[PDB]
Design a protein around this ligand. Sequence first.
Ligand code: CL
Ligand code: CL
Ligand code: MG
Ligand code: MG
Lengths: 405, 405
Amino acid sequence: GLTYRIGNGASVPISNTGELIKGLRNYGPYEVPSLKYNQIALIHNNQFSSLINQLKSQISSKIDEVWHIHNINISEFIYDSPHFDSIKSQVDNAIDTGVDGIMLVLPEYNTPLYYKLKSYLINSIPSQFMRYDILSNRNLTFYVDNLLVQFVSKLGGKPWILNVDPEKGSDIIIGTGATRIDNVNLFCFAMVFKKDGTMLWNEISPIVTSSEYLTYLKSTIKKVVYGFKKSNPDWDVEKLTLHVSGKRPKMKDGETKILKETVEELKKQEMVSRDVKYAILHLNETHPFWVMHPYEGTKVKLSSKRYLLTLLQPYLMVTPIKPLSVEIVSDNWTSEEYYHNVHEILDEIYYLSKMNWRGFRSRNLPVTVNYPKLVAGIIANVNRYGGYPINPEGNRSLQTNPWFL
Amino acid sequence: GLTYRIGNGASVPISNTGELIKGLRNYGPYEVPSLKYNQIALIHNNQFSSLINQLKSQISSKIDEVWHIHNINISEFIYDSPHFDSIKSQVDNAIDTGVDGIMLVLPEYNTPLYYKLKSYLINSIPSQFMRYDILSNRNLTFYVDNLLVQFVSKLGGKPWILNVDPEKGSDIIIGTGATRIDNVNLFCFAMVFKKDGTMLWNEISPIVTSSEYLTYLKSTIKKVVYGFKKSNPDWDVEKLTLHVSGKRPKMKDGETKILKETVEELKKQEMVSRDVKYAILHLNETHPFWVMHPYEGTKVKLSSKRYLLTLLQPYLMVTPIKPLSVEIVSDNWTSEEYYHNVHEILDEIYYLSKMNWRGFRSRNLPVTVNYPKLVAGIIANVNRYGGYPINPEGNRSLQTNPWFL
DNA sequence: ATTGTACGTACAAT
DNA sequence: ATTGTACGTACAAT
DNA sequence: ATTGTACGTACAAT
DNA sequence: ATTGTACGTACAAT
Ligand SMILES: [Cl-]
Ligand SMILES: [Cl-]
Ligand SMILES: [Mg+2]
Ligand SMILES: [Mg+2]
């Protein structure tokens, strides 16, 4: 069945972390990140610690041997006290020396300090946080293994992509919708993906009130298609799918009407093909249930437009299911192609549920739903603890890299 | 897996009508009905019709050769006009000669006449109706084949029973609840079954208003247990299950409270064992869905007390499911036996979904739910068109035979 | 904040 | 009393 | 009323 | 326009 494509034309089976890691060592990742300085800063307050030295050695050898990123040096920067100003001084010191990314070790749980520093770094340079007190109580091998998956991704590398039939499925999938941060405030999102699970462009709205939802939903989607088209100017999108998700205002028929208008305007502006075939889907995580591989990829039809994908819960009697409801709220398909297109979009959602660059283990949740949830967590908490605002507009690094992992 | 037990200790696979019919011819039914007169009346208004003669010959030879009911003679009675009084004269003439049952051919669709005659016959003698205009447009072989399944059952025979492990499942299952006949009026029902799918006793309430529901629900259940116990005086019920169904007043917590009281009173009166283990289940047919034998008998857990059985739709791309929701609203099981008992009651419901004496083909709906629906259809329409009331109390034939098929 | 489970013991609601 | 959460700690993952 | 499907064409609701 | 019913006729079942 489905496989992951890594480097040198090799592919490895899904649902098998051991073979994925082994394949990376043999063949490299799908794309090794391009770096300016070949330099990574490690920033901590545990100078001469043995654990810091063990961590640095594993990072160094695995960046070389697993990720095939050669000639990297790691520089150390020591902050004197675990507070914002003292750590920020060392972050700025690291940036001044010329580094491709920062790995920042914090001593303990500290939510305001974390989100203030994280929002500063997201606006500055690819970064990876670590907790020393958790690091001290973990298998270092597993810790660094998965750590490097998302750090390499943050640096712009592509660890692996989905091996999918290039003749089936959408040209692009737009994950879009909004996420509430409280009873009144929200932000809209729109993320463009290839059918192989790679993210091409990201846009998010400013935080606004629910009264402004549909205005900013349309504008955020137009902005992400503009950015996708400018960065991919020869791509003619003839097969388009919207994956709408997020806890958002209940305005279903008004929202569908606006999403349809948006697609039509983008056709008018020739941002997608004038003959584009599209569908607008609602993706909702529903209540889990338990059957007391027969359901790996099973598709359930509830009505002509409501479907259910029985995604397996990652777990260690009963088989747990994490179902995903998929409703077709709008499409321009003909009756003759309709159920062929239903199978294709459902298979596509299943494939995308296997993409996750946070770590080696699949999340079994489509990236079009999962990655906005990660973004929501950061935007909400940066707002709550008053960090630096994150505005990907005008910042190509934020528009194209998975800074939210 | 599951098999049907027929005569002479033989058993045949489920879901295979051809082998079931062949097994009956070779081994006979599980129980051949006992008859007083060895005489069946055929009552029609098509004297000397060739089709009537073909029908009579198939009935005669199959009663002999498939059902192993020997030495039967069929007498004919001719009514002159298709009206109640003229047909009733021939029904009474048939009864006066001494017959074990009546087969009554009506010329066409006529709902008032059908239910007036049917309610008269149900109060008199086992009976089987037929429509001449439909009979003329059918494969006579298939028509008579299934016709005789339910006629033999109405005469008190047992065509086949479920082959079930005698050490698993309930001692008796009581199908109970109520069915609305309009927005205000209803009747309660209670049917006692063995785990092999045979009905032991039946009681129904008079038609009452919804305000009287819980009073008559309790009294109808007590009445059916009294009748089961009087007819089965050495049976010690230590494993009891209630299957509650029917479109009825929304009084869930009050209904559960009364059903629990009923079981406790019956324990007090020593109608069941004082150490009886029981569960009270709600069985609801839910919305069908389609998977786009992997679900023959599949059990889904939704919560600790809510389950789903994915019963297959009988049908001729997508696999249709007719799910059955099963909720445990009350039980006296211990925590240690609980999930063992959940599997047993769910398997038991699945087995009972294979019992259907209306014809050879399974209905894939548990008899504890299906047979009350058949009763509801008759009671409602006899009320609507003012036929003779059907009161099984005091009438052992109505309390023990499946007159509703 | 590598991430995710699994599972005690609490306490929340009815 | 009973049933869903809730919040810790434990620790698995290749 | 042997029963049950499957499926046109209508019309019902939005 | 679009999507669920609805009510006929057709006819399958072994
Ligand atoms: Cl569970
Ligand atoms: Cl369908
Ligand atoms: Mg991260
Ligand atoms: Mg019948």
